[PDB]
Amino acid sequence: MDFLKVTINLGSPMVEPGDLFHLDALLGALRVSEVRAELGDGINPRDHHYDLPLEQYRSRSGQWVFKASAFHIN
RNA sequence: GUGAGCGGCAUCCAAGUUACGCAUCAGAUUCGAGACGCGAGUAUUUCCCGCGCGGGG
Protein backbone atom coordinates (compact mmCIF):
# COMPACT_ATOMS: atom_id res chain seq x y z
CA MET A 1 0.00 0.00 0.00
CA ASP A 2 3.14 2.14 0.33
CA PHE A 3 6.86 1.41 0.13
CA LEU A 4 8.84 1.99 3.33
CA LYS A 5 12.35 2.03 4.78
CA VAL A 6 12.73 1.28 8.49
CA THR A 7 15.82 2.61 10.29
CA ILE A 8 16.63 1.72 13.91
CA ASN A 9 19.39 3.41 15.92
CA LEU A 10 20.95 1.67 18.92
CA GLY A 11 21.84 3.15 22.28
CA SER A 12 23.44 -0.11 23.44
CA PRO A 13 25.16 -2.91 21.52
CA MET A 14 22.88 -5.72 20.34
CA VAL A 15 23.51 -9.41 19.87
CA GLU A 16 24.58 -9.94 16.28
CA PRO A 17 21.86 -12.23 14.86
CA GLY A 18 23.14 -15.60 13.72
CA ASP A 19 20.46 -15.87 11.04
CA LEU A 20 18.27 -13.29 9.31
CA PHE A 21 16.53 -10.79 11.58
CA HIS A 22 13.24 -10.02 9.88
CA LEU A 23 11.20 -6.84 10.21
CA ASP A 24 7.92 -8.77 10.18
CA ALA A 25 9.04 -10.90 13.13
CA LEU A 26 9.80 -7.79 15.18
CA LEU A 27 6.47 -6.21 14.22
CA GLY A 28 4.68 -9.42 15.20
CA ALA A 29 6.46 -9.46 18.55
CA LEU A 30 5.43 -5.85 19.18
CA ARG A 31 1.84 -6.65 18.17
CA VAL A 32 1.84 -9.59 20.58
CA SER A 33 3.13 -7.25 23.28
CA GLU A 34 0.27 -4.83 22.55
CA VAL A 35 -2.36 -7.56 22.74
CA ARG A 36 -0.72 -8.86 25.93
CA ALA A 37 -0.96 -5.44 27.56
CA GLU A 38 -4.56 -5.17 26.35
CA LEU A 39 -5.75 -8.69 27.27
CA GLY A 40 -3.15 -10.32 29.53
CA ASP A 41 -0.72 -13.23 29.42
CA GLY A 42 -3.35 -15.92 28.82
CA ILE A 43 -3.64 -15.17 25.11
CA ASN A 44 -2.46 -17.46 22.36
CA PRO A 45 0.45 -15.60 20.71
CA ARG A 46 -0.22 -17.32 17.39
CA ASP A 47 -3.63 -15.60 17.15
CA HIS A 48 -2.30 -12.04 16.95
CA HIS A 49 1.16 -12.06 15.34
CA TYR A 50 -0.23 -11.85 11.78
CA ASP A 51 -2.28 -8.67 12.41
CA LEU A 52 0.48 -6.51 11.03
CA PRO A 53 0.30 -3.45 8.75
CA LEU A 54 2.16 -5.34 6.01
CA GLU A 55 0.78 -6.67 2.75
CA GLN A 56 1.61 -10.23 1.80
CA TYR A 57 3.31 -11.91 -1.14
CA ARG A 58 1.79 -15.20 -2.26
CA SER A 59 3.60 -17.62 -4.56
CA ARG A 60 2.23 -20.18 -7.02
CA SER A 61 1.95 -22.93 -4.38
CA GLY A 62 0.13 -20.73 -1.86
CA GLN A 63 3.23 -20.20 0.27
CA TRP A 64 3.05 -16.65 1.57
CA VAL A 65 5.41 -14.23 3.31
CA PHE A 66 5.25 -10.67 4.56
CA LYS A 67 6.74 -7.99 2.32
CA ALA A 68 9.28 -6.98 4.96
CA SER A 69 12.96 -7.49 4.24
CA ALA A 70 15.39 -8.79 6.83
CA PHE A 71 17.26 -6.09 8.72
CA HIS A 72 20.53 -4.97 7.14
CA ILE A 73 23.48 -5.00 9.53
CA ASN A 74 26.04 -2.21 9.11
C1' G B 1 5.22 -15.65 20.18
C1' U B 2 12.78 -10.32 17.55
C1' G B 3 17.18 -18.53 16.07
C1' A B 4 13.49 -15.94 20.57
C1' G B 5 13.07 -17.82 25.58
C1' C B 6 16.73 -19.64 30.47
C1' G B 7 22.32 -18.88 32.36
C1' G B 8 27.53 -14.97 38.54
C1' C B 9 34.02 -15.55 35.61
C1' A B 10 33.94 -17.49 40.48
C1' U B 11 36.77 -19.21 44.21
C1' C B 12 42.52 -18.96 46.95
C1' C B 13 47.57 -15.78 47.18
C1' A B 14 52.62 -10.80 51.83
C1' A B 15 56.24 -7.23 47.40
C1' G B 16 59.27 -8.71 51.13
C1' U B 17 64.25 -9.36 52.78
C1' U B 18 69.67 -6.57 53.50
C1' A B 19 72.45 -0.98 52.95
C1' C B 20 76.12 5.13 57.51
C1' G B 21 75.18 11.45 53.36
C1' C B 22 80.01 10.59 54.87
C1' A B 23 84.80 12.29 54.55
C1' U B 24 88.05 17.57 54.03
C1' C B 25 87.29 23.88 55.04
C1' A B 26 89.76 30.66 60.19
C1' G B 27 84.22 35.72 58.91
C1' A B 28 88.93 37.33 57.98
C1' U B 29 91.35 41.84 56.91
C1' U B 30 90.69 48.55 57.81
C1' C B 31 89.32 52.62 59.99
C1' G B 32 89.61 59.02 66.73
C1' A B 33 82.94 60.03 69.67
C1' G B 34 85.46 64.28 68.50
C1' A B 35 84.09 68.37 66.31
C1' C B 36 80.46 71.88 65.59
C1' G B 37 75.40 76.71 67.74
C1' C B 38 76.08 84.68 66.48
C1' G B 39 80.84 85.64 73.54
C1' A B 40 84.06 90.71 68.12
C1' G B 41 79.04 95.48 65.51
C1' U B 42 78.85 101.37 67.85
C1' A B 43 72.62 104.98 65.25
C1' U B 44 68.90 107.61 60.58
C1' U B 45 67.98 106.80 54.86
C1' U B 46 65.98 105.92 48.31
C1' C B 47 65.20 104.48 43.74
C1' C B 48 62.06 101.00 43.37
C1' C B 49 59.43 97.18 46.00
C1' G B 50 54.35 93.87 48.52
C1' C B 51 50.09 97.67 46.16
C1' G B 52 46.13 104.66 53.23
C1' C B 53 48.98 100.08 55.49
C1' G B 54 52.97 96.26 54.73
C1' G B 55 59.97 97.04 52.71
C1' G B 56 65.45 96.54 50.93
C1' G B 57 71.70 96.97 54.56
Q: Which nucleotides of B are covered by protein (CB under 7 A)?
A: 1-4
Residues 6 or more apart whose CB falls under 8 angstroms from that of A69 comprise: A22, A23
A55, amino acid identity: E
Angstrom distance, A15 CA to B11 C1': 29
* Of residues A45, A37, A38, A52, the one with CA closest to residue A6: A52
Element (DSSP H or E) covering residue A38: helix A23-39
Task: Tell me the structure's resolution in angstroms, rounded to a single decimal.
Answer: 3.2
Tell me which residues have their CB below 7 A from strand B: A 15, 17-22, 25-26, 28-29, 32, 45-46, 49
* Of residues A63, A58, A59, A50, the one with CA closest to residue A24: A50
